[PDB]
């Protein structure tokens with residue numbers, strides 16, 4: 005009812021009341037904590053009986069936000085919604101409700117450290133779309149708008165909500181822009197190893213792969229439960245940064261580059277019990293995502309060795325910290341490169357400090373701020389960023405982004 | 419909680435099935451609605467006996483003799499002894515088993531592959547602070563072992579009524595001192611200002627430099643605590659130099675060899691050993707990242723990078739990161755040159771994955787706190803970052819307990 009969190013570096017204490025409005029499973033029980041499990045665990049469409057309570061709850065809070073709680077607008081909306089559910093077994097969100105819900109799902113995303121930006125989100129209503137070609141057009145405009153010549157702008161595009169589960173819209177890509185990965189007969193991997201399965205699907209659908217280290221994957225788009233269709237994103241819309249280093253003249257010879265726009269397209273947006281299974285959203289990068297995870301995870305581009313080599317690092321024993329030494333210079337290269345090309349990026353120190361400031365303001369004005377420590381803390385230099393020493397509470401507020409099965413595991417073909 | 423619980427390693431796709439969690443008992447603090455995995459810290463007649471019953475069962479189950487020979491008569495004996503003494507006293511074998519399993523069940527501890535190679539010092543005959551000091555001195559000398567450190571625990575008398583607790587008032591057997599300065603700043607270890615002031619209030623004569631070794635403040639049987647100076651020749655210390663930066667030695671940095679936790683409470687069979695200092699050897703990052711680089715500790719980043727002559731204006735130069743790596747290089751290089759036992763976070767984390775695999779195979783699970791197990795530097799390049807971990811409390815265990823000065827009724 006009045007849960008306290010403490011910062012162990014500053015001794016600031018915060019009081020959380022917002023946790024009382026939480027709902028869905030964390031995955032934890034009184035006896036077991038799952039806060040490091042990645043995701044705790046078709047038919048999934050709700051009844052009329054399940055829907056109105058969820059809908060009423062979301063409408064009640066929308067109206068509470070606009071300072072109209074209990075108004076005649078509020079009461080007619082509740083009636084309009086209840087009646088629409090009763091006669092059509094679902095309901096449609098006003099455009100105002102759609103924008104509020106998108107922004108609040110971002111605000112409520114406990115694993116997201118950049119939520120200080122949550123209310124500055126551009127929302128593209130794509131609920132009038134009916135085909136895969138239409139989807140391709142809607143996504144291109146999103147990419148072009150969000151990219152903005154390097155001055156990135158947060159955005160989400162929202163396609164039609166689920167109905168009976170059998171007519172879903174999906175983006176089969178997990179992100180709008182990612183690089184292919186090709187496994188070789190000899191077990192080696194060309195390109196990004198994370199993407200080998202999906203690259204294989206693309207090729208199976210007719211994609212002619214150029215078979216390179218940095219090939220942009222086609223889009224694979226599903227409208228109204230139909231089979232998905234392929235579309236090349238027009239290359240002039242895919243902004244890319246070549247990775248050089250302020251001090252090492254040789255770093256450019258590593259031939260590394262990355263795309264500027266991170267855009268998640270495999271999650272599911274829940275608003276008032278309604279499920280938007282295709283809602284690609286996009287922000288700008290924290291530098292550690294590229295330089296620590298994409299380049300350095302052993303199951304990703306795995307360049308630590310090569311960088312280490314060119315630094316002439318003693319790689320005999322681990323205790324030389326040759327990996328730690330090499331990772332820092334990679335992450336210096338990535339930030340310096342985006343900055344040099346005026347492509348929006350944020351470093352892990354700036355980003356985490358901003359988050360603490362956000363979290364503190366959310367406690368003051370909203371009464372809480374659910375945060376997943378295991379994801380908020382950056383994957384390098386942890387304890388020298390302020391979030392490490394920050395106690396956080398994790399709970400699920402709705403509206404929310406949620407994981408959903410991979411469409412190729414669920415879709416039934418024709 | 420369901421028949422299984424599987425956990426996955428994302429870097430390797432290795433999957434492990436947990437069944438041990440069906441034996442946890444106490445609150446994690448989490449509920450189905452909210453999770454507290456990052457919060458630091460979320461008996462009488464009927465109370466005491468069933469905890470003893472479970473442990474003895476656990477013990478006799480642990481030696482292929484469940485329900486067997488002495489087992490029932492040990493259950494009888496414990497039942498009988500509680501009836502007369504209100505509590506009961508652990509056999510030497512039980513004490514060794516419980517202490518080793520307290521380490522085993524320590525979800526926050528990355529070193530637990532070593533758990534069963536623990537040296538147990540039974541100090542349950544102690545009666546005075548002078549005796550506590552002797553028992554501790556012998557622990558420190560054994561555990562230090564001229565640099566080839568060995569893990570040990572010394573267990574003082576169990577609690578009996580709260581009025582007569584045995585307490586080590588230092589949080590570690592060996593810490594440096596912290597002095598407030600006439601101009602608001604701090605000299606020494608800033609985490610230790612309060613304790614340093616208590617010791618001075620108690621008559622400690624401080625030399626007033628950075629790395630002054632704190633005295634021992636021992637409390638036996640609930641009486642007021644007493645100061646003792648550990649004999650310097652027992653306190654192994656390492657001067658931190660760098661294998662590349664000649665100027666690094668000029669930083670004046672040194673640190674001690676023996677991490678030895680003296681403020682926690684060891685729980686076996688419902689009994690409470692409020693004095694039980696235990697010591698291992700260091701993971702390099704504890705010294706280099708946390709002690710040296712936490713802003714509320716020695717806070718040397720600015721110092722190091724300034725002599726590294728790094729661009730310290732904008733954060734995105736990553737000057738803190740660069741200096742941080744160099745510092746922890748110097749710590750490992752310093753301990754290894756002085757042949758003092760130390761482990762880096764790559765070896766340690768890799769060791770913990772083997773242990774996890776071992777525990778799942780032989781025991782059916784291994785409680786781990788991902789938040790504490792992942793090193794505070796270079797997270798995702800160690801193997802524990804990609805390891806799912808379940809966390810749950812098993813007994814016997816080490817627990818936290820209140821600072822004695824917040825609770826002590828002075829004689």
Ligand code: HEM
Pocket residue numbers: 106109110113115116117118119121125158159160285286287288289290293350355379405
């Ligand atoms: C504005 C700049 C943004 C920054 C700097 C940022 C930062 C991050 C980072 C570093 C992660 C962890 C990703 C990983 O390690 O895989 C993350 C996750 C996430 N972000 Fe943000 N983000 C931003 C924008 C957004 C927006 C616009 C939304 C939604 C409208 C959003 C929703 C999420 C969600 C749902 C996750 C969880 C991802 C998952 O569970 O797989 N973020 N964010």
Ligand code: HEM
Pocket residue numbers: 520521524526527528529530532536569570571696697698699700701704761766790816
């Ligand atoms: C032998 C080498 C050992 C290594 C390398 C090691 C490593 C570590 C590290 C790095 C931590 C985190 C400490 C912190 O960040 O404050 C920790 C915590 C802990 N270790 Fe170990 N450890 C070792 C031995 C032991 C022994 C012998 C015991 C008990 C008999 C033990 C019990 C614990 C406990 C209870 C914690 C929890 C700390 C807390 O709650 O504050 N460890 N260990």
Ligand SMILES: Cc1cc(N)nc(CCc2cc(CCN3CCN(C)CC3)cc(F)c2F)c1
Pocket residue numbers: 179181182265266267268285286287288289290293428
């Ligand atoms: C909106 C937004 C802002 C921001 N800064 N970052 C993101 C994450 C995007 C992103 C994440 C990933 C990796 C995430 N996966 C890895 C596999 N694992 C099993 C599940 C999690 C790769 C991208 F190529 C990519 F683009 C989104």
Ligand SMILES: Cc1cc(N)nc(CCc2cc(CCN3CCN(C)CC3)cc(F)c2F)c1
Pocket residue numbers: 012458590592593676677678679696697698699700701704
């Ligand atoms: C057995 C063992 C082996 C090993 N390698 N390390 C340890 C950690 C001990 C240790 C920890 C600390 C600080 C840790 N505190 C900070 C405050 N926070 C609220 C709780 C944790 C300082 C020591 F001087 C010290 F020694 C124990």
Ligand SMILES: C[C@H](O)[C@H](O)[C@H]1CNc2nc(N)[nH]c(=O)c2N1
Pocket residue numbers: 012392393394395396456457458789790791792
């Ligand atoms: C608030 C947060 O839980 C706290 O700072 C934790 C984070 N993880 C940690 N992990 C270790 N090993 N040691 C610590 O002291 C901490 N501190």
Ligand SMILES: C[C@H](O)[C@H](O)[C@H]1CNc2nc(N)[nH]c(=O)c2N1
Pocket residue numbers: 039040041042378379380381382428803804805806807
């Ligand atoms: C098992 C573990 O939860 C997993 O590796 C998580 C840990 N924390 C993370 N944190 C971020 N920001 N991104 C991630 O992908 C992960 N992966």
Ligand SMILES: [Zn+2]
Pocket residue numbers: 032036037038039448449452453454455
């Ligand atoms: Zn939990």
